[PDB]
Amino acid sequence: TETVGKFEFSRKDLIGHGAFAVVFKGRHREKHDLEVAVKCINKKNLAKSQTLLGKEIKILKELKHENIVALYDFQEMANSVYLVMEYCNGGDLADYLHAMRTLSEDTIRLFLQQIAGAMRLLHSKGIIHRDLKPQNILLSNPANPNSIRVKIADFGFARYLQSNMMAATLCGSPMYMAPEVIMSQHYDGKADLWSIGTIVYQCLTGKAPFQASSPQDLRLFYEKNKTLVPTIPAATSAPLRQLLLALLQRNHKDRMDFDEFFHHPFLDA
Ligand SMILES: CN1C(=O)c2ccccc2N(C)c2nc(Nc3cnn(C4CCNCC4)c3)ncc21
Ligand SMILES: [Mg+2]
Ligand SMILES: [Mg+2]
Numbered sequence: 001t002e003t004v005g006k007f008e009f010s011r012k013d014l015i016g017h018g019a020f021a022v023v024f025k026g027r028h029r030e031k032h033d034l035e036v037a038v039k040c041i042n043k044k045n046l047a048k049s050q051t052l053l054g055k056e057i058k059i060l061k062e063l064k065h066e067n068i069v070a071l072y073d074f075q076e077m078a079n080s081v082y083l084v085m086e087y088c089n090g091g092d093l094a095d096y097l098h099a100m101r102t103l104s105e106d107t108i109r110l111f112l113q114q115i116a117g118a119m120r121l122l123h124s125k126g127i128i129h130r131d132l133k134p135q136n137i138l139l140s141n142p143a144n145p146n147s148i149r150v151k152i153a154d155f156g157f158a159r160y161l162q163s164n165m166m167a168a169t170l171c172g173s174p175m176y177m178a179p180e181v182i183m184s185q186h187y188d189g190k191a192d193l194w195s196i197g198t199i200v201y202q203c204l205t206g207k208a209p210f211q212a213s214s215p216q217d218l219r220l221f222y223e224k225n226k227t228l229v230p231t232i233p234a235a236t237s238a239p240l241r242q243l244l245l246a247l248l249q250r251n252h253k254d255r256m257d258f259d260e261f262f263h264h265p266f267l268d269a
């Protein structure tokens with residue numbers, strides 16, 4: 001049993017691992033019924049892990065929203081870092097999609113309304129996420145789709161981007177990266193809208209809109225297709241087709257912007 005502030009956890013209760021973080025289920029030391037998740041360094045990548053957890057604290061201490069994973073407390077020292085975070089009892093969207101195969105349009109709408117709410121706050125604060133993918137969309141059941149609450153997670157790659165500036169750091173997951181990102185170009189907040197389009201498309205169809213054998217293959221594909229149109233099933237509703245066509249636009253200047261996204265007809269219906 002380890003303690004971090006008024007919280008505790010055991011390393012027996014592993015609920016996630018990646019190259020740059022390990023997450024354990026834990027609880028409040030006084031109110032044992034209050035569940036939390038404690039994110040820790042992965043010692044196999046100590047320096048980068050330490051950097052990314054520190055960045056996540058910096059960003060999440062400024063973001064409070066029902067559709068963003070909460071940061072209850074944290075502890076940073078010279079040689080260790082811990083985050084005490086919201087425990088999402090439904091796991092991730094990736095596992096949910098694997099089980100369901102595809103989601104209904106109505107479920108996609110409910111989830112995307114929530115993602116949109118979170119994105120409105122990121123956008124108003126001038127923050128870009130840069131690692132949106134189903135593994136980083138968590139679910140919480142307060143077990144039918146109307147009651148599922150979605151939370152964007154894993155803000156270790158997120159940054160402030162001033163509205164007249166562009167980012168250029170290569171980060172994210174290649175299958176969810178906007179063309180401009182994977183092509184090593186400058187990008188802005190609209191890169192995350194491409195990622196969201198990709199997630200929506202994957203929920204609808206069970207596949208990636210642009211399949212490739214490797215990251216390199218995907219990049220070459222984007223490079224050689226200056227006009228790029230996703231294959232959308234004919235049976236798709238007209239508003240969802242319109243949303244996907246506008247999000248999955250190769251050239252960022254032309255892509256759907258945040259105001260259009262937040263007010264898109266698909267999200268009313
Ligand atoms: C804070 N945090 C994270 O930063 C995060 C971010 C990205 C990806 C994973 C994370 N990890 C593991 C997180 N995972 C959970 N919840 C979670 C995981 N797996 N499960 C399953 C399902 C039910 N049955 C068994 C347990 C429940 N909440 C918060 C998490
Ligand atoms: Mg991130
Ligand atoms: Mg961009």
Ligand code: NA
Binds near residue numbers: 175
């Ligand atoms: Na993609």
